[PDB]
Amino acid sequence: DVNFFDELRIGLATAEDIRQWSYGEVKKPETINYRTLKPEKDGLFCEKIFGPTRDWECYCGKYKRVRFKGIICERCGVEVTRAKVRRERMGHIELA
Amino acid sequence: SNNSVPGAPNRVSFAKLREPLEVPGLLDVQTDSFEWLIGSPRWRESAAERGDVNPVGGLEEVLYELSPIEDFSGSMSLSFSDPRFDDVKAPVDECKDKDMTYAAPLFVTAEFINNNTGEIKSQTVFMGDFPMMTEKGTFIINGTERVVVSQLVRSPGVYFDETIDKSTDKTLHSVKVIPSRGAWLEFDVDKRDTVGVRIDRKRRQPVTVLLKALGWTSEQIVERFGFSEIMRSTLEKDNTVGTDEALLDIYRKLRPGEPPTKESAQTLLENLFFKEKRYDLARVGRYKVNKKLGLHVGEPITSSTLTEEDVVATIEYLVRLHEGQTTMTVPGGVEVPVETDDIDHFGNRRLRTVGELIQNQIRVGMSRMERVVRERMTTQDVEAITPQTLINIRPVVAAIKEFFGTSQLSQFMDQNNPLSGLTHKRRLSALGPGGLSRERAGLEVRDVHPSHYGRMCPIETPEGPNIGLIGSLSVYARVNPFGFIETPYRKVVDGVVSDEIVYLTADEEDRHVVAQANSPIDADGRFVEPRVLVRRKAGEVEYVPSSEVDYMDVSPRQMVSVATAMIPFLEHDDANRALMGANMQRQAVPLVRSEAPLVGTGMELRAAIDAGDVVVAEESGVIEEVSADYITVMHDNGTRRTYRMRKFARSNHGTCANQCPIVDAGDRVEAGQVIADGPCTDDGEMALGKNLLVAIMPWEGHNYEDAIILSNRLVEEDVLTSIHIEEHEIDARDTKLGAEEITRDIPNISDEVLADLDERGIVRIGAEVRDGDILVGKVTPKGETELTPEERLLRAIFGEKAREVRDTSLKVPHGESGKVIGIRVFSREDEDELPAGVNELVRVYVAQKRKISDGDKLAGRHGNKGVIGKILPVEDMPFLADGTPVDIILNTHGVPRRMNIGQILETHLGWCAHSGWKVDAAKGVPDWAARLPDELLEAQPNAIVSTPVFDGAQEAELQGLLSCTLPNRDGDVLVDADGKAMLFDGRSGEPFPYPVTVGYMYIMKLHHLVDDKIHARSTGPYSMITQQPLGGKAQFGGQRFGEMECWAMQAYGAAYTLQELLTIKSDDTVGRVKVYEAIVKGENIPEPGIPESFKVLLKELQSLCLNVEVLSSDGAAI
Amino acid sequence: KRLKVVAAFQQSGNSPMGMVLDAVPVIPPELRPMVQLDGGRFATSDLNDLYRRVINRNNRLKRLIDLGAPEIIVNNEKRMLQESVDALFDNGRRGRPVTGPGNRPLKSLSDLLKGKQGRFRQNLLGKRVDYSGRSVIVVGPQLKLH
Ligand SMILES: [Zn+2]
């Protein structure tokens, strides 16, 4: 990022803006699977919404090389990138 | 021989006064208490001496208060009495060896009453193992030597007070009867002139309410309290009229909104203060209440709960305290004085020691056992019940084992040397479970109180934030049954001093007039002068005509501790430097050789023999054969006693403990004589340092600002070498992936590195280990992942499989070296007790030998610390007219600033002890030596003198001793009448232009060594969650960069340095990786930008539905 | 006092509509980690229990609307959803806080900003660094002032 911030400003969000920040919707209450200790599909830890676990790896195992940057796997939908995005992509919930 | 000890080497003494009583066994406080708790004949004999009509053990008392248990039918019951112990499981040394606890098993004789049947069944119940105290006064929990510390609390009792009012400008007298355990009662006069009682921090009600509530008719109130006006006014001001109306009132102010019955109120008033189980005074509280009110002084009351007559006596006393009446009398009671109490005075501060403290845990655990027994006797059948089924041993075993594990007051024994341990056991601690907090204790609780004189040392205390909160028991002081500290006096009936001595407490002493041990005495005991100086009441000193003198002090050093007692010329220092001196002596490292000090106090033979680290001889006999390992003595009886000497034990604080047979073979040894020399002891004497030739001057700024110049001769001769013994421990614990193992081969380590280990996996004994080396070779079964393909080709070209095991081998931390002296292993097959889930534990001992050098701390005895800033080579030290070079050069500028000149006198006297002297006694005795003892007229070179505390060499006597020093083996005399000598400069070779003061001093090597206190860290291992460098001196953690260092940075204007510290040097992982990489690569370090932490602050503010955008110069977002 | 609060929303360009949430953000998964300890035990963060809770009460409410139900049941479920998200944003701010294990209040999401350990206080207190050490100092009167 550019090194030049004149000033910071804060405000209120909007549902039409909170939908913009988000990468998926968490709709299942469940966290990581108990057996294998991988995250559970479409919940508070899943790789689809947030990020892959190890660096440059999808979920099912159809890609574990580094040659493919930025591709989205069509069998499970995770994206092979650095695992550091695992702390920059935000979820969203839609309340009835 | 004036000294009691059989074969003690004798010190001529500058003692002017004969001591009436010899100093008691120093570890008495630690042994007596525990002897009382177990219940032993020795303690029974002591109670025979006191003449106590009640002989009871601490365990026996806790068994009376529990027995008998009964079911609410009363149809089944269970009581038990008469504890008895057994032989200890094993001897002490084996327990230090095998990691177990030296204890003894313990039974009781319990019985089960039955009413409807009429048959009572008795049997022997076992009650786990019980930790027992050794003769040294210490506990061995889990193989380590621990120590229970005595604790200072306020006793139970009745404390009157007077507090000034802010609104009406007039003082208000409030009482509190504070018991041992039970509800607080309290009475108080008001600014509106209205008495109010307050029961368990309830809302005040009128006090004639409770008075009427016990059963006091209005007429009896009128006649008993009639003379008092504020009590009468409070009998008007009350509203509730009648008995039950007041029990109902008390229930209605006890809790609001509860159904008020007359029977439940009358039941709770006698349930909270007169029920035996719910509320209790101890013997301390009961005795003290009796003594303060002057009622029931003749008979010993076994009942230990509050009584009603007592409460009426208290309210009459409070009204008396408002009156200003000196004397009260109660019907049925002797007369007493009337004054407000003081919580600081030592007659109110009782002290509860090991016996009381272990008794409390036995009690609480016992209660948790009693509930279980009560439910268990209700459920089981009357025919199939035995006293075996009811009692459950487990809940008490838990309580004790958790006391010795967790309780604040059972610490690791401080074992730097003998003096440190002996001091650790005599400690009076104010902190802990059941006392005032550290933040809660006001600034008055922490300072000296005129009643500590002779019980608690005013000088000795810790220096940090626990000042005043830990004192030390004085030399002669001893603790009586109830829990007060007593000091012995001698009594002067009519100006003549007796030989019989009485031990007084702090509150009994306030009632007489005590004269000090320097009063001039005839040979009859007749007072030499008309007026004596005396201490009267509290904090008052005054002259008195010789008839008003009741008591007198035992010894002029009655008011100091045991560590303070070993500071020659202590009345010449100030209290600050005296404090650092006492404090510092208990951090001296024991050397490889010991010598006793040429100038010392009479205290060190006694202290050494008591602190328990010299081996004494039990009987009298003749030495059979001497080993390095054991001494065998032949009694005159005919039976032989063999004593072991533990050789190089790792004491608790990493220093070494060594015992050395001192007697020669075929000798006659008296009973109770020293036979071996523990660490720090020479010839049976507390030797904490060495004698060194010191010269006082500045020397070309190498000792400037309190550093010290050492002569190289010390490092070559090994005068200050020590032995430090380490230990490291690693083990083989099961994980679900598999069971780890300790085995010789280790993947990817060459043969040379593994040469030291054997086939077992542990390093052989005596192989010098540089750090990073392997001591124990262990491998965890590596977590089963997939074998990496890049690693399949890398390992494929060579053909080496990363097995199912990673390498977690014990390694040598950086900064350690030495030999491997001994290893030790625990297995499941050996039948060793192991922790739950680990199969073998392995420890390894590494012992190095430290020579002194730069950056080690030295200290004299008067709190003159210092670091060694230089070590000159032998031929540079300023040397003496006969070519002896001095050893240490202590600067001048710190003597007159500290305001402690005891070190200069210690140096002068020390030089006189070195050379020996011969007064001019042919012409006659010169005047300055009139009162000099006869054994002192003439000493042989290197003779060890003693100068006690507050009674040593005077000035004129010292100055006169410096004129008679024996001339040197060359013929000449080296120091003049002043104590100054002529020195030659080692580098220049000229003589210095003035005389410098040389002489001897006693210097000790403290426990702040540069090898411990050095850590550096370029990178290391981080912590997953805080993501900062992992702290610790043992993992070479990184050193912390607080907030005032940032304010310094910003006052400089150093933007880039501070931004660098705060970001890539601690938090940002990306940053640290990039900087490390760029440094190894040899390119510029990246210019510091925006922390990765920023984006996280924004993701969290974006989590709270706030919306944060960044504005550029122009005003557009980014 | 009303005028001040009201005129704020006029100057901002931000509608007050943003005070009722039609959606809630979920914080990234790392800043509420669930890492596995050395002894096989799972160590997690407290926010996970709150998000899970709001997710539950939400899904159950929507199926309930699907089925059809009495008004008291739907109003009770709406109520629980509002209170749940309320405690997720800031605990113990309305009635009883929520406790998870053993009567221990849960660390809320507004809990990650306030306090001695919050994100604003973090950089002011100071941390331990790299490339550093310390030791005992002796005087050396041979050295030049630099
Ligand atoms: Zn996939």
UniProtKB/Swiss-Prot annotation, chain A:
Induction: 6-fold repressed by starvation. It comes from the Bacteria. Zn(2+) 1 binds at C58, C60, C73, C76. DNA-dependent RNA polymerase catalyzes the transcription of DNA into RNA using the four ribonucleoside triphosphates as substrates. The RNAP catalytic core consists of 2 alpha, 1 beta, 1 beta' and 1 omega subunit. When a sigma factor is associated with the core the holoenzyme is formed, which can initiate transcription. Belongs to the RNA polymerase beta' chain family. This is DNA-directed RNA polymerase subunit beta'. The lineage of its organism: Bacteria, Bacillati, Actinomycetota, Actinomycetes, Mycobacteriales.
From Swiss-Prot, chain B:
One of its GO terms (biological process) is DNA-templated transcription. The keyword Transferase applies. It catalyses: RNA(n) + a ribonucleoside 5'-triphosphate = RNA(n+1) + diphosphate. Changing H424L: In strain: SP28; rifampicin-resistant. It comes from the Bacteria. Changing L409P: In strain: vr2; rifampicin-resistant. Changing S410T: In strain: vr3; rifampicin-resistant. InterPro entries: DNA-dir_RNA_pol_bsu_ext_1_sf, DNA-dir_RNA_pol_bsu_external_1, DNA-dir_RNA_pol_su2, DNA-dir_RNAP_su2_dom, DNA-dir_RNAP_su2_hyb_sf, RNA_pol_bsu_bac, RNA_pol_bsu_CS, RNA_pol_bsu_protrusion. Changing L431P: In strain: vr12 and SP22; rifampicin-resistant. SUPFAM superfamilies: beta and beta-prime subunits of DNA dependent RNA-polymerase. Changing H424Q: In strain: vr1; rifampicin-resistant. Changing S429Q: In strain: vr9; rifampicin-resistant. Changing H424D: In strain: vr5; rifampicin-resistant. Gene3D superfamilies: 2.40.50.100, 2.40.50.150, 3.90.1100.10, DNA-directed RNA polymerase, beta subunit, external 1 domain, DNA-directed RNA polymerase, subunit 2, domain 6, RNA polymerase alpha subunit dimerisation domain, RNA polymerase Rpb2, domain 2. Keywords: Antibiotic resistance, DNA-directed RNA polymerase, Nucleotidyltransferase, Transcription, Transferase. It is an enzyme of class 2 (transferase). Belongs to the RNA polymerase beta chain family. The RNAP catalytic core consists of 2 alpha, 1 beta, 1 beta' and 1 omega subunit. When a sigma factor is associated with the core the holoenzyme is formed, which can initiate transcription. Interacts with CarD, TRCF (Mfd) and RbpA. NCBIfam families: PRK00405.1, rpoB. DNA-dependent RNA polymerase catalyzes the transcription of DNA into RNA using the four ribonucleoside triphosphates as substrates. This is DNA-directed RNA polymerase subunit beta. The gene is rpoB.
